[PDB]
Symmetry: D2
Subunit: 245 residues, 4 copies
Amino acid sequence: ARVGVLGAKGKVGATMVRAVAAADDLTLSAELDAGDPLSLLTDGNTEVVIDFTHPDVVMGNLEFLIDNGIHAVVGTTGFTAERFQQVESWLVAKPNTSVLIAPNFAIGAVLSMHFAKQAARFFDSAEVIELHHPHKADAPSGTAARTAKLIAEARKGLPPNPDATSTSLPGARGADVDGIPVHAVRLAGLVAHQEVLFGTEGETLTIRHDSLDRTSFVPGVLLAVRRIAERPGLTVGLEPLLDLH
Amino acid sequence: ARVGVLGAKGKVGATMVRAVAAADDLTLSAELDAGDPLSLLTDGNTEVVIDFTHPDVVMGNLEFLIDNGIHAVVGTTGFTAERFQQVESWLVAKPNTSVLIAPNFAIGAVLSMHFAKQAARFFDSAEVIELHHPHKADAPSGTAARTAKLIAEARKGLPPNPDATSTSLPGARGADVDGIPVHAVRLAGLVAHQEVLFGTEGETLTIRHDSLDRTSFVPGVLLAVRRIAERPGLTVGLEPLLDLH
Amino acid sequence: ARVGVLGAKGKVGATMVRAVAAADDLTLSAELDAGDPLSLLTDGNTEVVIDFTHPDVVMGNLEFLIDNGIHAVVGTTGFTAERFQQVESWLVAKPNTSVLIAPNFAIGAVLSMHFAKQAARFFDSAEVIELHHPHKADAPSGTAARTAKLIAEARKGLPPNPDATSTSLPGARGADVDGIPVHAVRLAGLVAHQEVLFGTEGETLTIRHDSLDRTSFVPGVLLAVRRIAERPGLTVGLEPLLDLH
Amino acid sequence: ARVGVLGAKGKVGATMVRAVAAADDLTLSAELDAGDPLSLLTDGNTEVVIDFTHPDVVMGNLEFLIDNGIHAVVGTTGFTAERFQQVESWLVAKPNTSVLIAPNFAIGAVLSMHFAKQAARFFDSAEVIELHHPHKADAPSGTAARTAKLIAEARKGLPPNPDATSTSLPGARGADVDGIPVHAVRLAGLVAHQEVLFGTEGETLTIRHDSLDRTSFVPGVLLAVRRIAERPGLTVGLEPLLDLH
Ligand SMILES: [Mg+2]
Ligand SMILES: [Mg+2]
Ligand SMILES: [Mg+2]
Ligand SMILES: [Mg+2]
């Protein structure tokens, strides 16, 4: 497949360039980083584009790709209901163009999240623990928050976690994301890790995702690049491409 | 829902009897043990039956229930392809009767199994650890083997687990269920536990299911009883009833 | 060894009574509850006494036992520096009497605590996770706090846990017991569990203690009773009796 | 302290050179790799030497260092009872020379091992799980074997692990090192990891050591280099220097 990479000197693109170069089945058709015109993509017959450039510029890129029937695997964040609306809009005019926007390309992470979603309604209790290196700026992770919201949403209409706590120390019970405790561990030696715990009297289920490399998103981006074709128009999140729905 | 229970003096039966009683939305309509004549089920307008009676007599029961339009949640094992085929047959005459047969009713167990199946093809490595009380007769557990099978099958066409082992001790690498290492830990204090691990360079995912009670199957049986009507004819395994969209 | 038991109608007492009975190398020589006169202990030539009676009456008992040369395994809490000091005093008059007072008799718990103390100064990061049934009143557990204290103290003079958190949610980082994060998980299905984690760039060490029974203190009490003679005067905490060379 | 490093182009030495160079309190006095005369050590007033050169040459080195009153932190393996005897011998003539020989310099590992040693006699069951990357040649690890031996030795005179297994699959119960099951997991994404499990009815204790870098031995070697002075003559294993005994 003829793959083009944007913001290709930026850490992700650069990595993706390497991934695509190394990869058997795909040929790298264009490597554009900032200061490069977008006409180069069509000039080399780019079918798919990987995009992870800054949020300010993504909208301007997506429009171009859509205009030109260029499939887009997008990893850039900063997307809003209103920005999805917008993309959803451009795609109306080009029904054969696929676009995938995903907050997270680590297959382990995405699976881990989807499993929590599916499990959450079958247990009395659910909590999230997340553990990261002590250089991380924010607590909980983006990923732990989004996870907790999903669980909360999946449990829309069950009782809240039982909990008889009556004296405590501030923070002893973690954060409270949509009614479900997120704990954040920061510990030397760690990279990125998350543990979703469910329990009910008699049994517990625990899902853990550990990520040891900056680079674990690669297999996912590649997956998306190899499959984006199968699903016309806008797809949000990688999970549909994992053929789980 | 008006529920009848067979094998009511065996361990599982006696349990569900308490269970059906305690449950508010359901009433118990007949409780028989081996040898109480089946007729009593219709005598009480039993809609669903829970069956956990011995393998020998299960086929005999299933016939009656299907004959009489009585839905059946069946937990007995010893089911074979040709036995399923048989059941499959009786059901053709009554398209309004639902029957559910499952190897396993612990919701946690069924979920952990399903997640493994769904995850299996996105990682280079997959192993199963099962941990049990030191009084268990067989290694690996029924559940561990079934699980390894599923993973093996979902990996039909990927390379086998990478493994450079060239010198070892017998058993150091555990069992080999269809190309997949299964390790059995036997340890005082434990009940029934299972941990599936998958790995790929840069990321790991682990699913653990812990069962602390004999009675963790109850929620599942109940769920099945509450839902069995939604699916006409034979269903195998609880996971379809865990309504997974 | 000829063993007497106080507070024999409370939960802990009644247990040790069964325990002393079952035990072959030991016989039970008196079992009193609040208000049975102490004299009965000597009336039966009781060598050691297990005490778990309420805090109010413990000092009253200890006096009698020490007066009479009767070794005491004491599990009651509510002990203060000045109460230890008092005990310490009574013992000066009888140098042949041994007394043991411990916050905690679960051998696993005491070991996990000790290991933490010994490990604490060789790592940059240290946190405590405790997980409990959702009916527990207080967060963190008594045991989690004691533990954090110990680690804090053993780290007297190292830098504090590294942590670049600058934006968070209240409680995301758990409690702060003496500079050490303690997180409390409350989850259906669980009993009493605790996981200490230490980390340093390149390596992590984790100690977990799981307690599945009300009755896990029994082996320790018994051990204490069997060993209390080996150490004259007051001993605090079971770990010295775990004979650590 | 005036530190000399041997085999200093070899992966360990090289690393140690860097560590010593970077390290505040120590000055690097000599960097000798193969082809360099040993007189250079004394020529620069080397107090301590780090040695990890090949086993064939170690004996020849140790003799020199001992002769010259040069302290030696040795990481080279291939040591035998008879080779310790030998070193023990050279040291007779120089009572002020310290020598430390250790199979393992990762403080986490050493702690993890020492804890298992101390715990092993207080539980009915003990097993070892070790997990490594799928490029590892041998199963179980050096470290898992040595660990199991220690446990076995510490349990010299208790009943063997209870275990009612009567049908199994070859390897389902792992290896059998001195009566205690070692399981080896090999999984993509992993580096070096070990989990010691103990259990007894009512409670379990679990010790886990994860190692994420080749380089986690550095802090230990440094520790030894900063402390070797405190203990005259031969010390085997790092654990005594961790002030645990
Ligand atoms: Mg290529
Ligand atoms: Mg009822
Ligand atoms: Mg007795
Ligand atoms: Mg220096």
